[PDB]
Structures are given as C-alpha cells and as structure tokens.
Amino acid sequence: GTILIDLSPDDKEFQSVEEEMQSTVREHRDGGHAGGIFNRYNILKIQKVCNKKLWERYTHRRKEVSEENHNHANERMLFHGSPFVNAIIHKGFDERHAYIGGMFGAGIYFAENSSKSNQYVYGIGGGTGCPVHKDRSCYICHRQLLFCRVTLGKSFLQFSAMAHSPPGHHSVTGRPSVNGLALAEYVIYRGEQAYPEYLITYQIMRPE
Ligand SMILES: Cc1cccc2c(=O)[nH]c(-c3ccc(C(F)(F)F)cc3)nc12
Numbered sequence: 001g002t003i004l005i006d007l008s009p010d011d012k013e014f015q016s017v018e019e020e021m022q023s024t025v026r027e028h029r030d031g032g033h034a035g036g037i038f039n040r041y042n043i044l045k046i047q048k049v050c051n052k053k054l055w056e057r058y059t060h061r062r063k064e065v066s067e068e069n070h071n072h073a074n075e076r077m078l079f080h081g082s083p084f085v086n087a088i089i090h091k092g093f094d095e096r097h098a099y100i101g102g103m104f105g106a107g108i109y110f111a112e113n114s115s116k117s118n119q120y121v122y123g124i125g126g127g128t129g130c131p132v133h134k135d136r137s138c139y140i141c142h143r144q145l146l147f148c149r150v151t152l153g154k155s156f157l158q159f160s161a162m163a164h165s166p167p168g169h170h171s172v173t174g175r176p177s178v179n180g181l182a183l184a185e186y187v188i189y190r191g192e193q194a195y196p197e198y199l200i201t202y203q204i205m206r207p208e
C-alpha cells in the first residue's frame with residue numbers, strides 16, 4: 001500500500017527538508033570511517049512516503065502516548081539510516097529494525113544529526129561500504145535516509161559521554177556529553193511510534 005510521491009525542488013516542503021538534512025551535518029569522532037568524509041550532500045530526490053495503514057497505526061499510538069503525557073506526544077522529526085530502508089517504507093518500523101547492540105538497549109535509533117544517521121546507511125559502523133565499490137566513503141553510489149515523524153512522549157534522559165522503555169517513559173534521549181557539537185539521539189521501543197515520512201536519496205560530496 002505504499003506510494004512514493006516525488007517533491008519538486010521548487011516546493012517549499014522539498015526545501016525545508018533539504019535544509020534540515022544539510023544543516024545538521026557535523027564532524028564525527030571516527031574521522032569519517034563509518035559514514036565517509038564530507039561537509040555536505042548532493043540531494044538527488046526527496047519523496048513523500050504515503051501509506052494509510054502505517055499512518056493510522058502511528059496516529060493511534062500517538063494518541064495513546066499523548067493521553068499518558070498530559071496531551072503531549074512530544075513529536076519530533078528525526079533522521080534514520082538503515083540497510084532496511086526499503087522494508088521500512090513498505091512494512092513500517094518493527095522489532096527487526098532494532099539495533100540490538102545500541103548503547104541504550106535494543107530499540108530503534110533516530111538522530112538529530114543527518115550525518116549520524118548517514119553512518120548506518122550501509123550497516124552498523126558503515127558495514128563494508130557501498131555494495132558496488134565496497135567503500136564507506138563512496139562519492140558515487142546513491143544513498144537513502146528516512147526523515148521520520150517520531151513520538152517520544154515522556155523521554156528518559158541519559159547523559160552519555162527489542163527491550164522495553166524504562167518504566168514510566170516512552171523513549172530514551174541520548175544527550176551528547178563530551179563532544180559539545182553533537183546533537184541528541186533518540187530511541188523508541190515500539191515501531192508504531194515512528195512514521196517514515198520522507199525518503200531522501202543523496203550522495204555525500206567530496207570536500208574541495
Ligand atoms: C545508534 C544510532 C544513533 C542515531 C541514529 C541511528 C540511525 O539512524 N540508525 C541506526 C541503526 C543501527 C543499526 C541498524 C541495524 F542493526 F542494522 F538494523 C539500523 C540502524 N543507529 C543509529
């Protein structure tokens with residue numbers, strides 16, 4: 001039931017999504033090992049992901065969380081990078097898209113920094129890189145990220161230098177804690193708490 005609608009580069013929606021992607025690039029402590037060396041992307045396409053069933057599943061859960069949290073879903077728009085991007089847009093998020101080894105337990109991880117999510121496009125630690133060139137810093141192959149609507153509800157704050165949410169909470173917030181430049185990371189434990197709204201196809205660009 002999923003359809004992908006292309007956004008025109010002239011469309012204001014295209015532009016605000018591209019700005020959030022571009023402006024949330026930062027330097028990483030691995031020096032580019034996992035996600036490659038770049039300061040910006042070449043955006044090739046942005047598509048709206050439309051699936052009535054997944055949307056209703058998301059809104060239903062959103063309403064449950066909101067009613068547990070003084071009518072506040074604490075909804076964010078966050079990046080997600082995964083080798084399973086193609087299953088997620090068709091079937092939604094679930095237990096099979098969890099990161100079992102994650103630092104906040106086995107849940108589904110999301111980032112404010114687009115460049116953090118870029119590190120997982122080819123797998124954990126960037127895996128072995130693009131399938132064509134086996135290169136984690138490939139400047140040629142097309143990459144995809146999701147920009148997702150995520151319900152955090154009451155989020156447990158972890159200061160940091162499928163399982164369950166900590167009791168009384170709906171999510172975990174990974175607060176950046178030595179690297180003063182890093183934005184937060186977030187984890188949910190129910191797939192119904194995210195909807196994959198935009199599919200962004202891009203390349204990382206080699207610095208000149
Ligand atoms: C940790 C973390 C922080 C912020 C953003 C992300 C993010 O966007 N993706 C992943 C990610 C990790 C593993 C898998 C896999 F096991 F392959 F299914 C998929 C996605 N981790 C993140």
Ligand SMILES: [Zn+2]
Binds near residue numbers: 130132134135139
């Ligand atoms: Zn490649």
